[PDB]
Design a protein around this ligand. Structure first.
Ligand SMILES: *[C@@H]1O[C@H](CO)[C@@H](O[C@@H]2O[C@H](CO)[C@@H](O)[C@H](O)[C@H]2NC(C)=O)[C@H](O)[C@H]1NC(C)=O
Lengths: 227, 55
């Protein structure tokens, strides 16, 4: 089918701008790419529900926005690149969250056939992106501090001090894909996040390493875990 | 040459085709800047990924 991949988000100061991109790939029925359908942006603040922001039709018409983002945010699409955009301006702290790209079900045009749909349906979201996170905070970014948790049994990795989310954990490039438990992060008293990650191993020991990836600071650590 | 002549709705658009899409329009047949279609016909198309049998 059609797949969607948001990108271009992270940490930005209040009152600043940021441009998210949504890239389409693959095709549904009749070789229909993303330019056959109408897309919306939908954001989710940490711990809350889904908020719809804006919609655009296949040809780029019938734009509309939610009152909360009207005037600040602008939707658009380069169908030649099968890409959507969201140009955010004057970013407020409550704009923080995971911004999603979501395709609408109904086919809106088939350009080579000379067929358009007279209306804009805006019906069910049958395809979503993995999401890209936007953190609006004037606090500076800081790299993660990682320390081992040496040893059925258990060996872990303690990512102690960083800001902001998210990080990416993967023990030995997905070697331990069973029994893992990357724990939800907490906000330490200092003000920087902390996080642990674990895996269960039996009496047999082989070397085990954890691969840490923190995008906003170009951080990538393959920390060891020997007894 | 006609003694009389009047036009009537043989197949009322929305009521006649509940299970197909009727709002098809084309840039080939534009009316009022926007692109539309014939006034006496309907370009029936798939609805919900299905073109049910029609009679
Ligand atoms: C819609 O109509 C087509 C033909 O107009 C039907 O196609 C038949 O399908 C059966 C199997 O269900 C085949 O054995 C026949 O060979 C097909 N052709 C004909 C002429 O019968 C189709 O079944 C119809 N759809 C429904 C849901 O009844």
């Amino acid at each position: 089918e059609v797949q969607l991949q948001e990108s271009g988000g992270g940490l930005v100061q209040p009152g600043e701008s940021l441009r998210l991109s949504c890239v389409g790939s693959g095709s549904s029925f009749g070789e229909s790419t993303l330019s056959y359908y109408a897309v919306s942006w939908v954001r989710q603040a940490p711990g809350k529900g889904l908020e719809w922001l804006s919609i655009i039709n296949a040809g780029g018409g019938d734009i509309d926005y939610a009152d909360s983002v009207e005037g600040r945010f602008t939707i658009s699409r380069d169908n030649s690149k099968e890409t959507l955009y969201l140009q955010m301006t004057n970013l407020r702290v409550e704009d923080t969250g995971v911004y999603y790209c979501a395709k609408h079900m109904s086919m809106q045009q088939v350009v080579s056939a000379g067929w358009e749909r007279a209306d804009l349906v805006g019906d069910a979201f049958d395809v979503w992106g993995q999401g890209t996170m936007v953190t609006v905070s004037s606090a500076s970014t800081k790299g993660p501090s990682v320390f081992p948790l040496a040893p059925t049994a258990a060996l872990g990795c303690l990512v102690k001090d960083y800001f902001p989310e998210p990080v990416t954990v993967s023990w030995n490039s997905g070697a331990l894909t069973s029994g893992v438990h990357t724990f939800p992060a907490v906000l330490q008293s200092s003000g920087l996040y902390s996080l642990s990650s674990v895996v269960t191993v039996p009496s047999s020991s082989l070397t085990y390493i954890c691969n840490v990836n923190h995008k906003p600071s170009n951080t990538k650590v393959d920390k060891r875990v020997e007894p | 040459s006609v003694s009389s002549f009047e036009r009537f709705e043989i197949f009322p658009k929305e009521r006649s085709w509940p299970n197909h899409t009727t709002r098809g329009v084309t840039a080939a047949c534009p009316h009022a800047r926007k692109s539309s279609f014939y006034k006496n016909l309907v370009w029936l198309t798939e609805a919900n990924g299905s073109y049910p049998n029609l009679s």
